[PDB]
Amino acid sequence: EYNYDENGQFFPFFVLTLTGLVTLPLTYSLLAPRIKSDFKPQHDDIIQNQKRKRLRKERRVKRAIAVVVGWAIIGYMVYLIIVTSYSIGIALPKLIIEEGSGKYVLMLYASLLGILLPYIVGRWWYGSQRYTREKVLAASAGNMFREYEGTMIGGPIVNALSTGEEYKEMLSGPKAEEGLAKVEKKVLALDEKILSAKDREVLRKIDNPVRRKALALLWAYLNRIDLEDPVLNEEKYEAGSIALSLTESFTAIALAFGNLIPIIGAYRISQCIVQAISPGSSPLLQLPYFTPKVVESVEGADVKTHLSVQKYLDMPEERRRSLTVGPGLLTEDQYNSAIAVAKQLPLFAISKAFFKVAGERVVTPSSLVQLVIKGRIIPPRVQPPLAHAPYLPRDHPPRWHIFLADAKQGKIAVPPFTFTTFDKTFNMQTLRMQFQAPPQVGNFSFVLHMISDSYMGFDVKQEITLQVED
Amino acid sequence: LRVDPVVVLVLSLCFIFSVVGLHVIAKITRKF
Amino acid sequence: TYTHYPLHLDPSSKAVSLATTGQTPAQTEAVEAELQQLNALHRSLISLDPPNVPPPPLPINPKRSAQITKLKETANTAYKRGNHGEAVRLYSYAIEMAAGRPGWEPVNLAREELSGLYANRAQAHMAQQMWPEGWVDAKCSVESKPVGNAKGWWRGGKCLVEMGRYDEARAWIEQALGIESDGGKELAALLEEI
Amino acid sequence: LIKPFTPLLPEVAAPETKVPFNQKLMWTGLTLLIFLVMSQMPLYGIVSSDTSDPLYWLRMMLASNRGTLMELGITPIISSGMVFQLLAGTHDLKTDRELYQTAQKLFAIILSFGQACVHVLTGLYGQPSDLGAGICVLLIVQLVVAGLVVILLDELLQKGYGLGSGISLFIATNICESIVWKAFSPTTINTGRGPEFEGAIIALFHLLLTWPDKQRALREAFYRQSLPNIMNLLATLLVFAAVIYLQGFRVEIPVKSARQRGVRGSYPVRLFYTSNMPIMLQSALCSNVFLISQMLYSRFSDNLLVRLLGVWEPLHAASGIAYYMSPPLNFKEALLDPVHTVVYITFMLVACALFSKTWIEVSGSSPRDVAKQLKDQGLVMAGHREQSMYKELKRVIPTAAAFGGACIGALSVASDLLGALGSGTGILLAVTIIYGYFEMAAREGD
Amino acid sequence: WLTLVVPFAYLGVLIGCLATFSSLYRRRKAAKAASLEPWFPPHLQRDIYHSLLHLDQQQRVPETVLKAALLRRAAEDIKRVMAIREQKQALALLLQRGSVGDELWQRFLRAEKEMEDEVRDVVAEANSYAPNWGQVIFQSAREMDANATYRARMEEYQATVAEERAWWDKKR
Amino acid sequence: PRDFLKDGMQFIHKCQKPDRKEFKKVCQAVAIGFVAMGAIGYIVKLVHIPINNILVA
């Protein structure tokens, strides 16, 4: 019961107004600190280029074609405009309802609604299913879950972590067998037995190019091996960044498991991956100008205990003659910078940690009780300085994990509470966390762990006694 | 008897297409 | 369903042997180790009794227990004489006698017996100033039975403090106190020796 | 007694695990698109469409359309529940609940079939003697399968794959379509002098560009008084913003539990207690009165009771009770008859207030009931030595409800009188439902 | 009577298309679900036992070695059962967080059903061999497995005394 | 009479008013939802007017 416009004087106005309302908006819409360091590691160009390549976003091709076609149709419609007792009509061209193009437009609409909708729906469905919560592929998490063992800490964590899925897309094609022999020989030969004992057998046993290459590259990275190939470093410093996210996923999995040793293990492997040190090696390699030689020369010839940063800095002026002697060990101009950058690391030293229920004196069973732990950041919504490790592309904001477990059974008590900010070279701080008290009556014995990633050697382990009565 | 969630959607789509198919078949029969 | 492995039994030996083909050296060595363990189990079962089924683990034969207690008693009364060479020799002999027993029997009995024997041998080595062997024996004993034992933790911590490595001694005594009273008193006294 | 009908009835499968939020939103959007594209498709046996629309005042409340595949899609789903709740109240185990659900669906489908039959036989699509021998049963089976597919989609959306129910979404989408079509409508209506556009913005642009006087062009674009203009759009936007701002009035009462010490909390009581009930039921009552008036005025044309109850004329009720119940057309008709405006004001205000105050007692949110519920849950007043929950609760809730009813009634009246596009009932039913679903979503995944 | 047959034919075509699509989709879903990689590596002791039975059929072999093979298979099976029972709780608790995909839960259920069928089959085969030889099999299996892993751990801890003595003599 | 209005105004003054930021956020969210539904409905109707006019003939 409508009368279309065939002479062309009404549809141009409507289409012009609509496409203008669209294109105007589409065109108008598409028109914290860092720590001080005067040291640059080897292969600076590679790591800096990788850091710059990590982040990238254009957001211009999506709207450019839309805006240009909108302005083109606006120009065409305004050109057609400048060219030129009760009935209702429609501002639409006549050729749409003509007997010639009728079946054509009908079949076009049918094909559109039958193909484009289900195809794009299935695409979005299978595009938002493979990614998990921790930004890792579901295949990777599934493959890593089965590799979980009862009590694995240190070594086997790297083996259970080197079964990821990003390595498939990283070195796909002929990139797997390029320097496999070279990297494998270097890793298996140059490293001593105190850094790998049976991992050599676990590495030799597998028969798969992608996974073996990934594992060898991860070890070569975690040992600061400096292989001579100028093309393999650009993928090693990327395997490290992939291993970091896989470490986050493995921490999530081990936390899902109700065990204690894998938790500390995952935290230590996250501390080691974010840096360049090796799991089990002296944590003294966090300083800028330190090499295996000087750390072997400072902590003794052969020792089973590794001098942490606190006990190293707390020595009297004997390190001056014991470390930077001069014959190939170090230089005073470098040792001064090392000390000046070591005197700025965040170390959390807690002083008081007591339970307290909100609005009551004595903790009642099955009540919501919160603990206040007040320490003081002393170096050996305020943001802390970023990580100091220069051997990874991304910059990691140093976080802190606070949890507590019991000793009568090797199991965790409450889930951890991760945070990254303080309330501001030292001043008192405060940190809170709330959970549910046990249902029954009887004092318990807990120990909280101040395990923190982004650094190795900053751990506080204190025992707290809980009180409960009625 | 239970049915999968995609089956009701494919049934809705097949019904929507069957309606227009019947319409166009009747139009073809009338035109000739 | 299953994968057919070409086997070949050897008469008069009653021990099956794999014939050469799963077209893989890893599979070959795996099935070879499995076959060796199977032959060992077959020897144990043929040495069990005229029947072949293993008896249930509810009853326990007392001959092994009597023998191991007699050996432990004579080793202890020989060590009390003053010498230690023959003492640790008898300790190792009793350890071998205990470990050489089948596994279908209850594990708690063998576990506790090995705990006691390892503790005694660790104390004997402590009497011989041999620190590494004593420490590793104490570690074995405490790994066997952690709860209900304190002398093991104490000997381990003392061996550590005698040989150094103060951090490992701290961690050892810390875990001991976390597990945990004469044991608690000895642990506190050893921790105060830092 | 309804056991054998259990295995025959089709039913959607239960979800394996808890579905995420994005997939649920996708399911909801796809079901809504399917419902809309099905409601915008015509039937086949349509031969005569020039006839007065029966139950025309029910399309807005039932979210249906005349002469399309969705003529009676919504009625069986609501009717089955509305009768089954009553038969259950007049007069358990899962083995009985399964039978109950099967009987509900069977009643729904048989009522769908019966309504399709009474729709095709009454003469809506023409005299059955002239339509065809098989065309009638063809239309029957087509409308029956449409009702079946729509109720199956509703059951799927309700079983857990959807974020809420389908009735509210279906009522809101039609209102939102009618309110956004009124703005950029391409239909032109030539009543002489030259055709103009029905859409508001399109009409403004066209009149501004083609007429020789910009002053007269703007004076025409504003205050059209016959077709939707920009002033009505601005009034609708203002009413929308006012309702959105007014919905966020909540009286937080301090409460702390007594089963586990220390835990605090709050129990809000919104100014819009029983958000969209006093408007929906009042509009349904008015629609039923109007329908009865029309049906009794068509047959009994000449009588005293029909003359006093309601008289219609080109329809539009005039000089009758239904004329008083009908809202004023615009501001001009409002200023012409002041007594009609005043009686409409007072009727709608008192009706909304009384309806809210009597629905709060039946919905189960009475102070005597919710106080006992909170006491059984363990919550106790957190006031300073003021341990009296029922007193404060009975002093707060009833007045709050009896004031919110009148407030939302006055809002609807102001929206319908200022000139807002579409009936104010539709605007409120859209805004309240969208706000409820927004808060439900924001309380779920982000 | 085309008026009587046209709507019936239309509805028949519709229901037939619905039914054939339902059958095709069910078949495709079943074929896709029954084509998942197995959870645990291929069983070896059961393969050795079946090969021993095949060698016995295609032939002389005694019967005690068969009992030893079955005992070893039962030990492996009970270790597998312990592992799956340990992993069940962690997987169930982790599935809700969404950090794990969906196919893993299906693989886990399939592995659980396979283990149930396998334990039923092995207890039946055991009851076939000896009079009332069902539960003593699993008791012996768990005891043997625990004792073997304990002995392995003990030997591993004992195999470090040489390095310890070397280190102490070096530091001395 | 007037007691009802007085009690209502007292309840209103007893309530707490929302701020500007939360109001702006909720208004933006509801407007996004409304505009989405409206655009979908408008496009469906605009694409089904000519298709229907061709189909029914």
Side-chain angles (χ1 to χ4, degrees), chain A residues 2-22 25 32-37 39-43 46-55 61-62 64-84 86-97 100-102 104-192 194-320 322-324 326-331 335-423 425-426 428-458 460-468 470, chain B residues 1-3 5-30 32, chain C residues 1-31 33-48 50-51 53-72 74-79 81-95 97-179 181 183-184 187-191 194, chain D residues 2 4-10 12-15 17-49 51-89 95 97 100-126 128-129 131-184 186-212 215-312 314-329 331 334-336 338-375 377-383 388-415 417-446, chain E residues 1-36 38-46 48-57 60-102 104-111 113 115 117-120 122-124 126-154 156-162 165-168 170-171, chain F residues 1 4-57:
Chain A
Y2 291 100
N3 181 22
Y4 284 74
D5 171 60
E6 65 279 352
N7 200 23
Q9 287 85 10
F10 291 143
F11 79 88
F13 289 109
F14 152 74
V15 72
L16 179 141
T17 297
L18 192 60
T19 70
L21 182 156
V22 175
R34 293 182 174 269
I35 200 167
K36 174 64 62 180
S37 158
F39 155 74
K40 183 62 64 178
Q42 304 292 341
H43 307 266
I46 296 95
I47 174 63
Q48 288 294 149
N49 175 264
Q50 185 64 255
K51 183 182 305 181
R52 271 184 295 182
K53 180 197 169 185
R54 191 59 49 185
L55 60 89
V61 57
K62 187 260 303 179
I65 64 164
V67 171
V68 61
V69 62
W71 271 89
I73 195 166
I74 281 292
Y76 169 66
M77 294 313 173
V78 70
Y79 155 76
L80 189 54
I81 282 300
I82 299 302
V83 159
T84 317
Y86 194 89
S87 315
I88 58 180
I90 309 187
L92 288 176
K94 180 60 179 181
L95 71 89
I96 302 180
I97 198 167
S101 279
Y104 291 163
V105 59
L106 171 62
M107 209 63 59
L108 181 140
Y109 151 80
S111 88
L112 189 145
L113 192 135
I115 302 308
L116 273 296
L117 186 68
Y119 163 80
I120 204 64
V121 160
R123 191 59 52 186
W124 178 91
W125 202 358
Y126 291 165
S128 159
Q129 186 73 9
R130 58 190 180 95
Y131 264 75
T132 64
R133 181 191 302 268
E134 279 68 19
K135 265 60 184 178
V136 287
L137 311 185
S140 198
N143 205 333
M144 191 156 52
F145 168 82
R146 190 162 64 258
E147 303 292 336
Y148 174 84
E149 208 181 358
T151 63
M152 53 175 183
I153 176 181
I157 304 176
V158 177
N159 294 335
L161 179 136
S162 183
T163 72
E165 264 295 328
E166 289 77 356
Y167 305 101
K168 303 286 183 54
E169 302 171 13
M170 181 261 287
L171 55 88
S172 167
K175 207 174 185 181
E177 297 288 332
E178 183 171 350
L180 175 60
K182 177 79 64 179
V183 174
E184 210 274 350
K185 178 257 300 182
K186 187 68 61 54
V187 160
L188 196 141
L190 186 44
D191 288 332
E192 209 184 8
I194 53 180
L195 304 95
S196 55
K198 60 101 180 181
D199 286 317
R200 301 184 177 185
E201 185 271 346
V202 177
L203 161 69
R204 184 189 54 85
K205 190 260 298 179
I206 70 176
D207 45 15
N208 196 333
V210 60
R211 188 205 174 182
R212 186 155 77 175
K213 164 60 60 62
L215 179 62
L217 200 61
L218 190 58
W219 272 113
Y221 168 47
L222 284 173
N223 276 334
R224 285 186 168 189
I225 205 56
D226 190 340
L227 56 88
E228 82 291 345
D229 202 336
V231 70
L232 299 177
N233 315 341
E234 187 166 63
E235 73 191 31
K236 180 181 62 175
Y237 290 169
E238 179 270 353
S241 162
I242 290 300
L244 189 42
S245 315
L246 293 181
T247 300
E248 275 185 355
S249 182
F250 174 79
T251 284
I253 292 187
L255 192 152
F257 263 100
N259 218 7
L260 179 59
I261 294 299
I263 294 296
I264 297 300
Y267 284 156
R268 292 192 189 278
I269 209 58
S270 180
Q271 301 168 255
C272 273
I273 281 185
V274 72
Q275 314 273 139
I277 66 191
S278 180
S281 278
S282 279
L284 199 51
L285 275 299
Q286 303 159 348
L287 306 186
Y289 277 70
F290 269 55
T291 198
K293 177 58 183 178
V294 300
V295 61
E296 192 66 281
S297 165
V298 66
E299 73 186 1
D302 190 10
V303 301
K304 296 296 171 53
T305 317
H306 306 279
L307 271 193
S308 316
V309 194
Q310 291 88 16
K311 282 169 291 186
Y312 167 71
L313 278 180
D314 285 330
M315 295 202 308
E317 291 302 319
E318 180 191 356
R319 66 207 178 195
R320 181 60 53 88
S322 165
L323 168 79
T324 179
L329 294 181
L330 259 189
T331 53
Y335 169 72
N336 286 329
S337 45
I339 295 302
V341 65
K343 279 188 181 301
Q344 297 179 176
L345 280 84
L347 159 67
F348 200 62
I350 78 184
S351 87
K352 285 174 289 183
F354 52 91
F355 283 90
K356 180 190 64 180
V357 56
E360 202 171 2
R361 305 176 296 101
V362 177
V363 180
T364 298
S366 192
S367 158
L368 185 139
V369 62
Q370 65 183 12
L371 63 89
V372 288
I373 180 166
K374 37 175 55 183
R376 40 200 301 193
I377 290 289
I378 60 154
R381 74 279 190 191
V382 185
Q383 302 280 134
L386 298 182
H388 180 269
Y391 274 71
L392 82 165
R394 297 187 285 99
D395 288 333
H396 205 198
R399 306 198 301 177
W400 314 79
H401 294 203
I402 293 189
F403 66 90
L404 57 87
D406 47 3
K408 267 68 178 183
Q409 47 182 1
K411 200 169 300 299
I412 195 175
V414 305
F417 173 78
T418 77
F419 48 81
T420 184
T421 179
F422 293 142
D423 309 323
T425 61
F426 37 83
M428 293 197 61
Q429 315 288 321
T430 185
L431 297 164
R432 308 197 178 192
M433 176 189 174
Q434 55 189 13
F435 71 111
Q436 183 176 357
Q440 55 185 12
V441 179
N443 60 330
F444 301 101
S445 316
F446 287 163
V447 293
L448 54 77
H449 290 295
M450 203 57 203
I451 294 294
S452 84
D453 43 13
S454 316
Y455 298 97
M456 191 166 189
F458 302 147
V460 177
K461 186 175 66 64
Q462 189 178 356
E463 189 172 304
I464 290 173
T465 80
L466 186 62
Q467 283 293 340
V468 62
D470 201 338
Chain B
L1 177 60
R2 289 173 174 82
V3 64
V6 191
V7 185
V8 67
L9 300 189
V10 78
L11 165 63
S12 278
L13 206 65
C14 86
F15 174 61
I16 291 298
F17 275 147
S18 159
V19 170
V20 57
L22 193 145
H23 279 187
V24 67
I25 284 302
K27 171 192 173 183
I28 288 300
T29 298
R30 178 202 299 179
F32 172 77
Chain C
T1 56
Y2 81 101
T3 168
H4 186 283
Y5 278 79
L7 308 184
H8 187 280
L9 177 58
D10 190 328
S12 62
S13 84
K14 310 305 176 183
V16 305
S17 198
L18 168 75
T20 311
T21 174
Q23 291 80 30
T24 292
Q27 307 176 0
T28 304
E29 55 87 15
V31 303
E34 190 67 32
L35 210 72
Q36 290 297 331
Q37 291 192 18
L38 175 57
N39 292 327
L41 263 181
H42 168 274
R43 299 175 203 276
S44 181
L45 281 176
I46 202 62
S47 159
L48 198 153
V53 289
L58 281 193
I60 298 181
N61 165 79
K63 181 61 194 66
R64 165 186 66 172
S65 278
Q67 184 180 2
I68 189 169
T69 62
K70 292 199 309 302
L71 263 59
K72 173 181 179 178
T74 177
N76 177 254
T77 180
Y79 151 76
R81 196 204 65 83
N83 46 3
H84 311 297
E86 52 86 20
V88 310
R89 193 266 174 182
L90 266 62
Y91 280 150
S92 69
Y93 182 72
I95 291 166
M97 167 61 62
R101 290 312 195 96
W104 57 69
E105 297 201 12
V107 75
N108 294 22
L109 189 144
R111 173 167 285 188
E112 291 189 359
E113 288 182 348
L114 286 188
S115 158
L117 293 186
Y118 277 156
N120 283 337
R121 199 177 77 173
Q123 179 176 326
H125 275 87
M126 258 288 302
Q128 272 187 341
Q129 313 298 316
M130 302 178 182
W131 317 109
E133 311 181 22
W135 182 87
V136 71
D137 289 5
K139 181 177 181 178
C140 275
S141 199
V142 60
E143 169 58 31
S144 86
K145 179 170 52 58
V147 69
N149 179 19
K151 48 192 175 181
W153 307 85
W154 181 83
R155 283 150 187 165
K158 187 180 178 183
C159 289
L160 276 190
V161 175
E162 291 293 329
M163 70 189 307
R165 322 166 68 172
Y166 288 80
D167 272 8
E168 287 189 351
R170 280 192 66 258
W172 198 240
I173 301 301
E174 172 80 13
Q175 184 173 337
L177 193 142
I179 292 298
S181 87
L187 288 180
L190 186 54
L191 188 56
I194 186 184
Chain D
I2 54 187
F5 284 140
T6 317
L8 275 298
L9 185 49
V12 289
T17 80
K18 178 184 178 301
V19 289
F21 177 79
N22 285 327
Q23 186 164 343
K24 191 175 301 181
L25 171 62
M26 181 267 294
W27 279 107
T28 295
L30 200 54
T31 43
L32 192 71
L33 173 62
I34 285 301
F35 155 79
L36 190 55
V37 75
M38 177 180 295
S39 159
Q40 291 294 336
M41 188 68 69
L43 284 169
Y44 169 64
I46 52 154
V47 69
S48 45
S49 66
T51 297
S52 198
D53 187 295
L55 54 87
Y56 153 79
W57 289 278
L58 296 182
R59 292 280 173 260
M60 183 279 318
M61 180 49 60
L62 299 181
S64 162
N65 195 326
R66 187 255 177 176
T68 80
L69 282 164
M70 283 297 301
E71 173 177 353
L72 72 170
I74 302 93
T75 78
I77 310 175
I78 176 154
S79 278
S80 87
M82 204 58 178
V83 60
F84 263 74
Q85 293 293 146
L86 293 182
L87 64 86
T95 183
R97 294 201 54 81
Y100 184 86
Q101 177 265 355
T102 47
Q104 185 174 3
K105 282 196 58 183
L106 183 45
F107 192 92
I109 185 177
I110 190 74
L111 175 148
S112 87
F113 177 80
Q115 292 295 118
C117 274
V118 70
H119 266 272
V120 60
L121 290 203
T122 188
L124 174 58
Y125 297 87
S129 289
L131 318 174
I135 311 300
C136 46
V137 74
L138 188 141
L139 267 55
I140 287 295
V141 309
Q142 195 167 9
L143 274 298
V144 163
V145 75
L148 188 57
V149 70
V150 76
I151 190 167
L152 211 163
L153 186 143
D154 190 327
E155 192 203 89
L156 168 144
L157 199 67
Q158 192 266 355
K159 208 70 173 184
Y161 295 83
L163 77 166
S165 278
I167 189 52
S168 279
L169 272 297
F170 294 154
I171 293 186
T173 177
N174 201 23
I175 293 296
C176 170
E177 207 284 331
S178 158
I179 202 56
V180 78
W181 169 274
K182 193 65 64 67
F184 314 110
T187 292
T188 178
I189 295 185
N190 191 19
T191 185
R193 188 266 306 277
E196 312 163 349
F197 282 101
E198 183 181 11
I201 306 296
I202 317 296
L204 183 147
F205 211 101
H206 187 198
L207 274 293
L208 192 142
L209 195 47
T210 192
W211 268 24
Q215 161 64 31
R216 182 56 64 90
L218 272 296
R219 191 56 186 267
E220 176 71 18
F222 291 114
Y223 309 95
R224 299 171 64 97
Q225 306 177 25
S226 44
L227 289 184
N229 49 21
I230 307 312
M231 200 274 299
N232 293 335
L233 208 64
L234 207 60
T236 293
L237 196 146
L238 184 157
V239 168
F240 173 91
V243 171
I244 280 298
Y245 156 76
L246 198 61
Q247 187 71 204
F249 284 168
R250 46 181 52 184
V251 180
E252 292 191 1
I253 185 166
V255 62
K256 64 96 175 179
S257 167
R259 195 167 316 279
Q260 41 178 5
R261 301 299 203 280
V263 59
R264 297 304 190 90
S266 315
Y267 188 85
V269 281
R270 298 166 299 274
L271 178 58
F272 279 87
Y273 215 82
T274 65
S275 291
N276 68 327
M277 206 59 57
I279 283 300
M280 186 177 178
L281 65 88
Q282 185 268 358
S283 86
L285 174 64
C286 185
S287 197
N288 263 17
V289 169
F290 284 174
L291 169 82
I292 296 314
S293 160
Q294 182 188 52
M295 194 179 183
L296 188 156
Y297 182 84
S298 86
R299 301 298 99 93
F300 282 0
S301 309
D302 44 352
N303 200 7
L304 274 298
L305 57 93
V306 66
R307 192 87 56 84
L308 57 92
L309 192 143
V311 194
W312 306 82
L315 295 178
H316 283 342
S319 50
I321 313 303
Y323 166 74
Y324 278 150
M325 326 317 303
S326 46
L329 277 54
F331 197 87
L335 60 87
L336 295 201
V339 61
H340 159 69
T341 56
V342 173
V343 60
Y344 176 79
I345 301 279
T346 176
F347 156 76
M348 212 164 178
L349 269 292
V350 175
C352 274
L354 200 151
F355 277 144
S356 171
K357 199 168 185 175
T358 183
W359 173 264
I360 190 182
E361 300 285 348
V362 59
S363 195
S365 51
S366 87
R368 185 89 282 186
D369 187 304
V370 72
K372 163 254 179 180
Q373 200 280 336
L374 258 56
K375 191 82 63 175
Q377 191 175 4
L379 305 186
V380 187
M381 178 81 71
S388 54
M389 195 67 177
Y390 183 80
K391 282 86 174 184
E392 188 72 16
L393 191 62
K394 194 178 58 57
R395 205 196 72 174
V396 166
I397 285 191
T399 299
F403 191 75
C407 170
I408 191 176
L411 267 189
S412 88
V413 168
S415 86
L417 181 136
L418 187 55
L421 295 176
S423 294
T425 296
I427 308 181
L428 295 187
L429 282 177
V431 170
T432 295
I433 287 180
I434 289 188
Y435 175 83
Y437 269 78
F438 151 75
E439 72 91 9
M440 174 181 297
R443 205 191 57 185
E444 204 74 12
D446 54 352
Chain E
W1 298 89
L2 59 87
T3 77
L4 177 47
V5 69
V6 161
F8 285 160
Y10 163 82
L11 71 87
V13 166
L14 186 139
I15 182 174
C17 295
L18 170 148
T20 179
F21 184 89
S22 192
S23 279
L24 178 60
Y25 175 78
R26 178 161 296 181
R27 190 185 313 272
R28 172 183 173 269
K29 187 186 66 177
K32 187 255 298 182
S35 78
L36 291 176
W39 182 278
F40 69 114
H43 211 285
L44 186 56
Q45 292 77 357
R46 187 249 304 273
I48 287 186
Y49 171 57
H50 273 302
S51 46
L52 277 170
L53 279 181
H54 194 98
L55 176 140
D56 166 68
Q57 193 64 53
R60 193 63 189 93
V61 63
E63 52 277 3
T64 63
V65 62
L66 275 298
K67 303 162 184 179
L70 184 53
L71 278 172
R72 185 54 70 94
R73 169 190 171 186
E76 170 72 17
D77 266 7
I78 198 165
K79 178 169 57 182
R80 181 72 177 91
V81 166
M82 180 183 302
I84 207 72
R85 178 153 52 193
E86 182 190 23
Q87 290 183 183
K88 175 165 55 182
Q89 301 290 154
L91 184 53
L93 193 147
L94 187 46
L95 183 53
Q96 275 93 27
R97 276 190 175 90
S99 57
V100 176
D102 214 318
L104 200 73
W105 179 258
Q106 307 302 139
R107 283 215 275 180
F108 175 82
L109 290 184
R110 174 188 175 187
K113 284 332 191 303
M115 274 298 106
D117 283 7
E118 168 64 32
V119 61
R120 196 156 293 101
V122 62
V123 71
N127 207 336
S128 162
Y129 275 157
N132 196 271
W133 197 56
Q135 61 279 13
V136 286
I137 284 297
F138 285 150
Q139 304 310 126
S140 315
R142 61 170 66 258
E143 291 297 327
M144 178 181 307
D145 180 71
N147 205 325
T149 185
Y150 168 86
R151 207 69 50 84
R153 179 87 61 85
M154 203 55 59
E156 180 41 38
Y157 280 162
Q158 185 58 245
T160 311
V161 55
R165 281 296 306 183
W167 180 89
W168 171 253
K170 175 59 184 302
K171 192 177 181 178
Chain F
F4 186 82
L5 193 141
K6 176 162 294 184
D7 196 7
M9 193 170 300
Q10 176 183 355
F11 170 82
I12 287 300
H13 195 278
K14 185 177 298 300
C15 200
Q16 61 92 7
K17 276 71 61 178
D19 62 79
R20 280 83 65 193
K21 307 303 294 296
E22 181 73 14
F23 164 71
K24 192 68 62 180
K25 183 182 302 178
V26 72
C27 166
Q28 184 171 356
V30 174
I32 283 303
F34 206 84
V35 167
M37 288 169 51
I40 286 302
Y42 185 72
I43 290 302
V44 165
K45 193 166 186 60
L46 188 63
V47 71
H48 282 282
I49 291 299
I51 291 303
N52 173 23
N53 209 326
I54 292 172
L55 191 54
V56 62

